[PDB]
Curated annotation (Swiss-Prot):
Domain HP: 6-68
Gene name in the database record: DMTN
Family the entry assigns: Belongs to the villin/gelsolin family.
Protein name as it appears in the record: Dematin
Region of the whole protein represented: 343 to 405 of 405
Its job: Membrane-cytoskeleton-associated protein with F-actin-binding activity that induces F-actin bundles formation and stabilization. Its F-actin-bundling activity is reversibly regulated upon its phosphorylation by the cAMP-dependent protein kinase A (PKA). Binds to the erythrocyte membrane glucose transporter-1 SLC2A1/GLUT1, and hence stabilizes and attaches the spectrin-actin network to the erythrocytic plasma membrane. Plays a role in maintaining the functional integrity of PKA-activated erythrocyte shape and the membrane mechanical properties.
Coiled-coil residue spans: none
Location of the protein in the cell: Cytoplasm; Cytoplasm, Cytosol; Cytoplasm, Perinuclear region; Cytoplasm, Cytoskeleton
Domain notes: Both the N-terminal core domain and the C-terminal headpiece domain are sufficient for binding to F-actin and necessary for actin bundling activity.
Organism in which the protein naturally occurs: Homo sapiens
UniProt-reported outcome of changing residue 66 to A: Inhibits phosphorylation and interaction with plasmodium berghei 14-3-3 protein
Length: 68
């Protein structure tokens, strides 16, 4: 049960505004939207690298992507 992969930019809100996230988004878990080509290109790590990381490192990274 995972959220559909979004083309990052689909969630990469670049203009404040209380915008609404795609039908089924996870703030603290936005990464679940980043495609493998996006996660790996976003966090320079294998989508998996994350599936094995921690909540902290994950946070320190997600913030690097703005998916936090």
């Amino acid at each position: 049960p995972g959220l559909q992969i979004y083309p990052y930019e689909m969630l990469v809100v670049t203009n404040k505004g209380r915008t609404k996230l795609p039908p089924g988004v996870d703030r603290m878990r936005l990464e679940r939207h980043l495609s493998a080509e996006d996660f790996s290109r976003v966090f320079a790590m294998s989508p998996e690298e994350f599936g094995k990381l921690a909540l902290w490192k994950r946070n320190e990274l997600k913030k690097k992507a703005s998916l936090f």
